[PDB]
Design a protein around this ligand. Sequence first.
Ligand SMILES: [Zn+2]
Length: 261
Amino acid sequence: QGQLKNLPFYDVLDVLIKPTSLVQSSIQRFQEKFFIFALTPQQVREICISRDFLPGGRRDYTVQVQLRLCLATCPQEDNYPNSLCIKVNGKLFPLPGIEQKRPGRPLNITSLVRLSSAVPNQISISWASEIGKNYSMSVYLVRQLTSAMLLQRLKMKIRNPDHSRALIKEKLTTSLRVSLMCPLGKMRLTIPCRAVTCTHLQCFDAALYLQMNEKKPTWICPVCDKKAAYESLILDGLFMEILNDCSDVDEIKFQEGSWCP
Ligand SMILES: [Zn+2]
């Protein structure tokens, strides 16, 4: 209870505060709760040496303290309570009526964190309750990953050319036409990719798809607009073979796994 969905661009290094119910008075609308964590000496050093270019162009800590809120039992997306107000060591953390419907995201609170092991850090959370909607907070130490990093990991996880040949033949059992260009970026595919759930043969470029979700993480497949989560992604060996053999060719027709332009 209170566990959140995995974020593909973060590695969890530690749980600083385990999922914890934000208990509400039933009588008063507005609520406030305080939480303490304390970094170890090695965690402080971890943050301090971690600075690098982030997306946006800013140099900052890539090892971060990340606060997440969600409804309360299975893994949930980030969701905020009505009138959420967060203070960290007394300083207000700006966030990036009855029906507040604004979508939650993880909060990088590192820049208000006291980078010390001798002194505890403190977080205050205020909110206004809503009937039959219960929330939970947790705080993690995370390393933010780039798209290159996700790409690399994705490479270490690729699909037999024969799998797609059987979909070709178990589909045609006229002519099956497919493009070698990215529907996202319009240039020639470099690393061809789709979700295992996708029933189409058309691929998209892994690197460019992960660059887009790095900025605005929607995880929607550009070909068919179904869910295309990071963990569902595969790289098609067949389209990789075809890419190393073609040049100046944009589209191909498959027959009963042969292929012409
Ligand atoms: Zn799709």
